[PDB]
A paper describes a structure:
Most dsDNA bacteriophages and viruses utilize a powerful DNA translocation motor to package their unit-length genome into a preformed procapsid. A central component of the motor, large terminase, consists of an N-terminal adenosine triphosphatase (ATPase) domain comprising ASCE (Additional Strand Catalytic glutamate) and lid subdomains, and a C-terminal nuclease domain, connected by a short linker sequence. While both domains are involved in interaction with DNA DNA translocation is powered by the ASCE subdomain using energy released coinciding with ATP hydrolysis. The nuclease domain is responsible for cleavage of the genomic DNA concatemer at both the initiation and completion stages of viral DNA packaging.
Numbering used by the authors: 14 to 417
């Protein structure tokens, strides 16, 4: 373990000069070993400091908490001699060690079970994985539940805007809450090679570099996909031998409706051609029948055994139903926005995707998709939802197929 990771494991112990504190904030870069030592240190602290008490562990969703935190935490605890009994249906664990036993309830920031349970339960310590991605209403409610004598608060996240509730309320008022704060760059994880560290550097440019590599709380302003480059990302519209295929779709009778034909060739997805229909501009809105008829004329040429399905947003259920009637494979897209943008940026940085030069509406949109300046100075990083109709399709595709 690194010096900073070992400070997370030991701050709470009796010999430590900082064991006074009411809690701890660990933030900074990706792949820095924050979550894994933080969650491991939390259970150690709890099993040592208490007996027969309730504890909380929160994530964006409970399934997120389970992927990032809970599954690798079990192998860690089981290996150190901590017996765990996971009660998967009821969302809590029973960790037990040297005659002592405690209870660790699992929470989601958005979940309905989690609002119901958190309001009533009375905890002796709370932990937050990806705290910036959680509602502030949730953490204020959950911190009040830490009523038991000698409770400690643990927070864990990557950076966001400098006007974000957690940065402004929790991190700037650090001495006011008597919280400890360690900040993790990627050098604080010794398990990474210098070869592997510099690979992660190449995945991010711009705001996302400063946030997810340097660990800085910097402001999302101006153009979103600034790293897009018509030198690097545009290729000629000349045929190629594509292995698999997809069609990505942003649907709207009300606004423009887009398709995009994506094709795999030499481990790179090419946006082969675009469909762009604006009902307002054309002054004739299209029906689902008319749109389905267009998707067929749009994929007439390609070979149906390679065509692997249509990625489409869940709020087009009128359209989704008709495609399944007619017998098309229809993937409900991973809708999450900031996570989709960040992943598309990575795809451009690494050239996982390229564009044929006939995606002319896509390039226009690349040069106008900008951050909501008004919202970003509240601590809410969002796109301005205007001329983002190809880019939403491109986002669904990249997020749904390319990334996990
Ligand atoms: N002591 C260790 N031995 C081996 N691998 C480790 C060790 N500490 C951390 N790692 C690995 O380092 C990587 C990052 O650890 P995490 O705790 O998941 O990072 P993180 O800081 O939570 O990253 P984000 O912000 O959630 S992407 C994982 O692949 C871990 O398995
Ligand atoms: Mg983490």
């Amino acid at each position: 373990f690194s010096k900073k990771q070992l400070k997370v494991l030991t701050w709470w112990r009796k010999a430590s000069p900082v064991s006074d504190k009411d809690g701890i904030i660990c933030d900074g870069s990706i792949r820095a070993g924050k979550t894994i030592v933080m969650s491991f240190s939390y259970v150690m602290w709890a099993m040592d400091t208490f007996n027969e008490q309730n504890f909380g562990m929160a994530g964006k969703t409970i399934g997120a908490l389970r992927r990032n935190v809970i599954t690798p935490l079990k192998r860690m605890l089981k290996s150190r001699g901590y017996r765990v009994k996971d009660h998967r249906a009821d969302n809590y664990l029973t960790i037990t060690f040297k005659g002592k036993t405690n209870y660790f309830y699992l929470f989601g920031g958005k979940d309905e079970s989690s609002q119901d349970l958190i309001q009533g339960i009375t905890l002796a310590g709370m932990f937050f994985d990806e705290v910036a991605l959680m509602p502030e209403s949730f953490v204020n409610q959950a911190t009040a539940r830490c009523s038991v004598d000698g409770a400690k608060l643990w927070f864990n996240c990557n950076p966001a805007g400098p006007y974000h509730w957690f940065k402004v309320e929790y991190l700037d008022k650090l001495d006011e809450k008597n919280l400890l704060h360690l900040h993790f760059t990627m050098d604080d994880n010794l398990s990474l090679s210098k070869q592997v560290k510099e690979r992660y550097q190449r995945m991010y440019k711009g705001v996302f570099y400063q946030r997810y590599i340097l660990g800085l709380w910097v402001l999302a302003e101006g153009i979103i996909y600034d790293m897009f480059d018509q030198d690097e990302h545009v290729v000629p519209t000349v045929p190629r031998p594509y292995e698999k295929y997809y069609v990505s779709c942003d649907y709207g009778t009300q606004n423009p409706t887009t398709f995009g034909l994506w094709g795999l060739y030499n481990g790179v997805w090419y946006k082969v051609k675009e469909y762009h229909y604006d009902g307002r501009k054309e002054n004739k809105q299209k029906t689902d029948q008319e749109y389905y008829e267009d998707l067929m004329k749009f994929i007439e040429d390609i070979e149906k055994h390679k065509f692997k399905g249509v990625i489409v947003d869940p709020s087009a259920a009128s359209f989704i139903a008709l495609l399944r009637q007619k017998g098309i494979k229809v993937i409900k897209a991973k809708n999450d926005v900031l996570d989709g943008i960040r992943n598309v940026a990575t795809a451009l940085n690494k050239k996982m995707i390229l564009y044929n030069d006939c995606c002319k509406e896509t390039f226009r949109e690349y040069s106008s998709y900008v951050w909501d300046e008004k919202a970003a100075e509240r601590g809410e990083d969002k796109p301005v939802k205007q001329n983002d109709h190809q880019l939403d399709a491109d986002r669904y595709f990249v997020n749904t197929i390319l990334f996990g």
